[PDB]
Design a protein around this ligand. Sequence first.
Ligand code: NA
Ligand code: NA
Lengths: 304, 308
Amino acid sequence: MRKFRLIPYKQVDKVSALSEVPMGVEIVEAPAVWRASAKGAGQIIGVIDTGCQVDHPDLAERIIGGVNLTTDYGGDETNFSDNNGHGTHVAGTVAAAETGSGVVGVAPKADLFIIKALSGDGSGEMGWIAKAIRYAVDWRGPKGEQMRIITMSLGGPTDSEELHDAVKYAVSNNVSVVCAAGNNEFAYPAAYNEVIAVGAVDFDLRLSDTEEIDIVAPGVGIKSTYLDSGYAELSGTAMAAPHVAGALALIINLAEDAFKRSLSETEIYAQLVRRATPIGFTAQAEGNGFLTLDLVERITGQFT
Amino acid sequence: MRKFRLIPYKQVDKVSALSEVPMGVEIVEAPAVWRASAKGAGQIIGVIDTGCQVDHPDLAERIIGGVNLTTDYGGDETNFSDNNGHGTHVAGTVAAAETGSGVVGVAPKADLFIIKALSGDGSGEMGWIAKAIRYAVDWRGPKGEQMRIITMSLGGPTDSEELHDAVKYAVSNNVSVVCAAGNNEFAYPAAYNEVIAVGAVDFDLRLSDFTNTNEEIDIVAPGVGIKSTYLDSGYAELSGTAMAAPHVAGALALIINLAEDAFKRSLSETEIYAQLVRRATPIGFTAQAEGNGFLTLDLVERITGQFT
Ligand code: NA
Ligand code: NA
């Protein structure tokens, strides 16, 4: 393996068929805000991972492009197909489409831009990760479309100026950088102050497990898309982050519609924090709490 | 008056003696978080205003230093006494001490650093306001103390590089910059994206024409009939959009303490901002009118463990 790699996880199950809104999407309250958020239409998430099955039935209509920054496929930059499975799983939790079967993501009208920066074994060079971040920031679509969210479920032990500068470049250019905060060897980039660091809980809101986190989301028994047009149930710290990345698409639409202006990445971060409900551990352990997308509606007009 | 000046306000009453917790301190829920935040101990707020009555009895024990950046007192930099009143009133809302009498502020163990950047008439040169911001950022106490919060209740019509650079310098050096919204003669610095812009409601959480704003605001706090400290060891009741900002400046001292304890680590200006927004309860006005809501410091405790 190369130095930066996927935070370890467990495969619970693989199935060729599903038809449900996964419970993770349901208990972070995504369906409650879908109408007001237009399901994340108009936002694009750069998924920095192992690639994606581009013609997966739940995902094909949501992918707007991609790039391969790894040596895989002889270094062909137009081939971001998934030779691991993990990047396909991430993509589904973010933005699997409503198709009448399979699964549905947190933001089922957001667009995905697939950045394969990990090789088939789930590892990559620090420089690949730094370049993936800068690429995401700098990319422009045909009509000047850009990404405002990037998500990673990876870490490496080394603090390098190249990688930290990339993260600074992203947030200074109003891109939210989501990384899973997991188990030292996986410290960076999640440890950087600029990053929205996500921890995991199970569906009973118990912590999965010094990490400096901002928020928790579902990470146990998470069903999503996988290779060969089928599905897999994974459990790990890194299963949480993709929920937050889809949530950000919904929240930027919610907040900018409310405020009637463009909001900075600082302000978007506050709007995410706004929508976290403490479970009742300490903030050192759960950050701001559990992602609860409809919280603002519930507190409105509620006075002492 | 000069170009940059205090945002207009009314003096409703002026008394010699008072004994209460002003309602604004109450309704923002500051007492509910005092224990957890050690009443703002260890935090210093830079009050950029007309000076302060440095021996006021509600204030003298809270004040740790000052500077005068104006031409008042023939430019004596060590004379930051208040020749207007408004600075004293602000200082009181932020951090008036617990005494058995008088008033008490939102953060009654927070320290004040008094920066006189406005003249007796409540106006100042943009340059003085720029310098005041940088001054607060660069200042270090006898043991290396720093300010992490500055507050202003002023505005002027002109955007300039100098003033915006000062604001950015603060925020990039983790200093929260709080600004009252103007009631656009009073557009800057409150219109800078980097600043926390605060609007006003009254004690029924209602809007009023005199306190309304067209500024892009982040939060609202009480601004109508706010009793605080004033000249000659007395008290005054002021109404005005700018009455709200000091409630937020004090609140930040409480927030920084309680959130850095909760997280068990130092938090950036960005993170402190989120900590503030997460303690705003929407009242039902538009986001233009109220930003993220009304300052309710105990909100995080109220929502804890509450899932649908
Ligand atoms: Na589907
Ligand atoms: Na007192």
